[PDB]
Amino acid sequence: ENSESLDCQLLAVTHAGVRLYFSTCPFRARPNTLTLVHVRLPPGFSASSTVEKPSKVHRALYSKGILLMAASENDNDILWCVNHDTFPFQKPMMETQMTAGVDGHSWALSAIDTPLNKDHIPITDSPVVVQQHMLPPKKFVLLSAQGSLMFHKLRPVDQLRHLLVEIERFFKLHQEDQACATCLILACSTCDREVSAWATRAFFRYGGEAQMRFTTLPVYSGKHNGICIYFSRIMGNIWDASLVVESSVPCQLLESVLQELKGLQEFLDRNSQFAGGEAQLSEKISLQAIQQLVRKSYQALALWKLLCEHQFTIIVAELQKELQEQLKITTFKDLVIRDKELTGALIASLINCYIRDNAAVDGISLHLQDIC
């Protein structure tokens, strides 16, 4: 796809297992002859390799260069998969290639799920790290005559999990900030063993003892970046989008976001003492700001959870006046970093009118009192 790479139109896989990449240039009516941009060789280990020999047609490339190779030796059938390590790929390129369990003939491969690619531009297309949360888990289909095999991509969280006992390796490849972020997610992550959560909490809070230290240096510590990255990634889809059109996002989604942020809110609230309370002070300020932000998002989402319950649409239509243009082009972030007066008026209408039912209504009145 041009989204993945503007220049590269096609990839050819040979019987040898060599991958050829060709660039092109279209126009409204004329194609351009393809040129061979690059070539990749099979790892026997390296180049002269006959490991991939022979390679069957079954082989296919998964959007964002994930290579599934079906090889039929002249002794048996072998399956290999190559996935670029996106993380180190945040500059150098590296591919992790491993053998796979399937031994039977491989009829056809397909992707059960959309591709994980983050952006629709060559820039940040491949960042899996960013869309690890949002993008659905990647699942791959291998069809054999005998049965269907399902393969699952391993997320960075899983990688960290394996590494839980040594996380330097994650640190090395991925970087400290990312390690912190994943560490935070594991700590919060639900159905996890206490050992895992505690260890991840320990890493997040203290890093590795007498090894990797967790710190602001005369920039902000990895902890801050990790937490912020986490927050940014979850919200990334919704953040820019307009809140109201009916609400742009569905109720299920609202509940999902609210629940997730709630977990984070509680987490930070609980271990706020550690983070808060000059590089050190700057870290304190930054963390304080982030925590306030998480709570604020919680509040906005909470209100929306409320609105979903009922008769929101009718009031909206009747209410909107001259201010309306401003209202409609309000983004979620606008709520995140609030536009207080309009909401207050609207909320008052929700209460004044019958729409809010029972417990909900009490809550807004509480809200207006508290932060209004």
């Binding site: 790479s5 990449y21 941009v37 690059h38 990749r40 060789l41 790892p43 390296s46 490991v51 260069g65 996935n83 996106t86 790929f89 945040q90 500059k91 590296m94 591919e95 992790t96 290639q97 491993m98 053998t99 796979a100 009829w107 056809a108 992707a111 983050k118 820039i123 940040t124 491949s126 960042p127 790290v129 699942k139 791959f140 069809l143 005559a145 005998q146 049965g147 269907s148 095999l149 399902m150 393969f151 699952h152 990688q159 390796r169 912020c228 990255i229 940014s232 990634r233 990334g236 953040w239 300020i285 930054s286 700001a289 982030i290 306030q292 932000l293 604020k296 972030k333 995140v336 970093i337």
Partner: protein, 208 residues
């Protein structure tokens, strides 16, 4: 100074950084030689292994049973959007739910051997633009187009003939593909290319 604005700025900056991330493929990256973390052994890359095998589902015997007798031709495949698998033995075709397996659908419509099957998107503006996907089936004689959909009540699979038959006797349609324009291009064992338009007619692109 305000923390709230401050936090917003931090996230936005980071978001920007995430978006800027380098392009996946560059010739410069492996101009000398490829860095490979390649083990022959499963789970050889302990922490790193990109993929794991979650499960294996065998073809249901109930499905297989109606594949027992096949003189002429066999073929099978997976439909990516459907999350269903298909099996073709001679004239008949089966579709089976990936997740279930018990649930299978059978086509009794086709009289003749089935050369090829394919899943395609509907055209922008025909009577069936609404349907999510179309199933193209080619036999020696004809090409049939049906509609696939999911019942919202049962959540079962609904197949309806969108009676559209295209005579393609000579062709021996080897391959079928589509552009999401809704245009369908197929090739017979007759050289490189042909294109179908439902609005039946076949027109060779590569000129007859």
């Amino acid at each position: 100074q305000e923390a709230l604005e401050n936090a917003g700025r931090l996230i936005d900056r980071q978001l920007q950084e995430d978006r800027m991330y380098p392009d996946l493929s560059e010739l410069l990256m492996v101009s000398s030689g490829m860095d490979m973390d390649y083990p022959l052994q499963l789970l050889s890359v302990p922490n790193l292994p990109e993929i794991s095998s979650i499960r294996r589902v065998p073809l249901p015997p109930e499905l297989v049973e109606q594949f027992g007798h096949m003189q002429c031709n066999c073929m099978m495949g997976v439909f990516p959007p459907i999350s269903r698998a298909w099996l073709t033995i001679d004239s008949d075709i089966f579709m089976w739910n990936y997740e279930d397996g018990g649930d299978l659908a059978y086509f009794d419509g086709l009289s003749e051997t089935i050369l090829a099957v394919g899943l395609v998107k509907p055209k922008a503006g025909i009577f069936q633009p609404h349907v999510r996907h179309l199933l193209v089936l080619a036999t020696p004689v004809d090409i049939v187009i049906l509609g696939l959909s999911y019942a919202n009540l049962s959540g079962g699979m609904q197949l309806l003939p969108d009676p559209l038959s295209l005579p393609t006797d000579n062709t021996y349609l080897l391959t079928i593909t589509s552009t999401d324009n809704g245009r369908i291009f197929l090739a017979g064992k007759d050289g490189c290319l042909y294109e179908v338009a439902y609005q039946k007619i076949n027109h060779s692109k590569s000129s007859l």
